[PDB]
């Protein structure tokens, strides 16, 4: 005992291997792409962003962060987002500014969706 | 049968044998926390009569409580009232020390149920009791028809309602007939019965 100080010794601890699962339902992704992308904005200010900055405006879930948004637009419309700017509006909803990469034309995407 | 020899010895607390054995134990309890789990009753013969059995589900705890009376806990010894209620120091708690010990144990161990307790030691400032508790979730208790009653919901926290042996002592239920009739079903029940103004419909 070269130390005059006693320390608690290191003891083995096993991991949890339960005899039954506490949850048996698999657990389903309730924040899927349809919850993330609710609907696009069609205001006059929102329509200007389409042809001026290659940008689509969406109303998004409050629980959706920027990473889920760009993954959602890719799985919904097969387009690539260059960047996503988000805000929470004074009405309490979340609004996303989705700028598409060059070689994606938001006006063509806007025509396919139906907002134009 | 050796239990009679043990019981007879514990009646001679002032012998040299019991004084030495109690003095060493009293010192050791002083170096421990006030609520300590023990693997075995110190007085097995006294535990048998109070209901303890050497089975899985019966646990024993040693409880240390302070001795003396109950000083009135008012901010400076200052009472705002008539001189009959101005006393501070020489007042006494209505519950005994044995019930205080098993009530501390019950609050600390909410998953268990107090069976009863017995006296263990004292020096000048502390009294020591061992409290018997039952794990009413264990199958050994749930399958024993002599302790099954403790698993029923009407016996929850009986140490807090004065239903243990110590509680019956301070409730005045350790006697019968006159000198004790005011304590049944309870003193407050007796008082309410004697306050009633019975106004029958044919009077």
């Amino acid at each position: 005992r070269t130390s005059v100080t006693f320390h608690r010794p290191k003891t083995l601890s096993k991991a949890r291997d339960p005899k039954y699962p506490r949850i048996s339902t698999p657990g389903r992704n309730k924040l899927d792409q349809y919850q993330i992308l609710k609907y696009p904005l069609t205001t006059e200010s929102a329509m200007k962003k389409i042809e001026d900055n290659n940008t689509l405006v969406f109303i998004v879930d409050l629980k959706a962060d920027k990473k889920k948004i760009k993954a959602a637009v890719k799985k919904m419309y097969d387009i690539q987002a260059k960047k996503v700017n988000t805000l929470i509006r004074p009405d309490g909803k979340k609004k996303a500014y989705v700028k598409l990469t060059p070689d994606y034309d938001a006006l063509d995407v806007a025509n396919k969706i139906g907002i134009i | 049968g050796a239990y009679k020899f043990v019981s007879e010895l514990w009646r001679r607390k002032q012998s040299d044998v019991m004084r030495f054995v109690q003095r060493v134990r009293c010192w050791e309890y002083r170096q421990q926390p006030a609520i300590v789990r023990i693997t075995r009753p110190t007085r097995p013969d006294r535990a048998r009569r109070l209901g303890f059995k050497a089975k899985q589900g019966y646990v024993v705890y040693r409880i240390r409580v302070r001795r003396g009376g109950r000083k009135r806990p008012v901010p400076k010894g200052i009472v705002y009232g008539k001189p009959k209620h101005q006393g501070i120091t020489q007042l006494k708690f209505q519950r005994n020390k044995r019930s205080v010990a098993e009530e501390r144990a019950g609050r600390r161990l909410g998953g268990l149920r107090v069976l009863n307790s017995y006296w263990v030691n004292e020096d000048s400032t502390y009294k020591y009791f061992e409290v018997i508790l039952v794990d009413v979730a264990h199958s050994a208790v749930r399958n024993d028809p002599r302790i099954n009653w403790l698993c029923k919901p009407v016996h929850k926290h009986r140490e807090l309602r004065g239903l243990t042996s110590a509680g019956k002592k301070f409730r005045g239920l350790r006697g019968k007939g006159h000198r004790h009739h005011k304590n049944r079903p309870s003193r407050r029940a007796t008082w309410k019965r004697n306050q009633t103004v019975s106004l029958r419909r044919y009077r």
Partner: protein, 116 residues
């Protein structure tokens, strides 16, 4: 639509129906923000169909799990009662008495009698 038909379909077919109705509720939410007059009542019809499909899928899952577990049951599959009912002694435990009591019932039970 026609939950009776939904109960016939397999799990791959049921999730394929779930995907179609999600795509179609999204196309309506786009229509709702732009313009229409009779596509608006399809929202209620289709939203209820999504609920209908998810109910059938869920009810099949639980029935399957209840069959696969009939050792220890998962906590969500256990019989839910009041908390006090779950803490009760069994009838075997409530009806158990010791030998000295079982003997007196054997030798001296209450009799059937009458007064002349």
């Amino acid at each position: 639509v026609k939950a009776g038909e939904l109960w016939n379909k397999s799990k791959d077919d049921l999730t394929k129906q779930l995907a179609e109705l999600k795509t179609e509720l999204g196309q309506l939410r786009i229509q709702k923000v732009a313009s229409s007059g009779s596509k608006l009542n399809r929202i209620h019809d289709i939203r209820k169909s999504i609920a209908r499909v998810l109910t059938v899928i869920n009810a099949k899952q639980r029935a399957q799990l209840r069959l696969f577990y009939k050792k220890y049951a998962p906590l969500d599959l256990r019989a839910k009662q009041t908390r006090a009912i779950r803490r009760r002694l069994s009838p075997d435990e409530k009806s158990r008495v010791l030998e000295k009591t079982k003997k007196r019932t054997v030798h001296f039970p209450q009799r059937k009698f009458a007064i002349k």
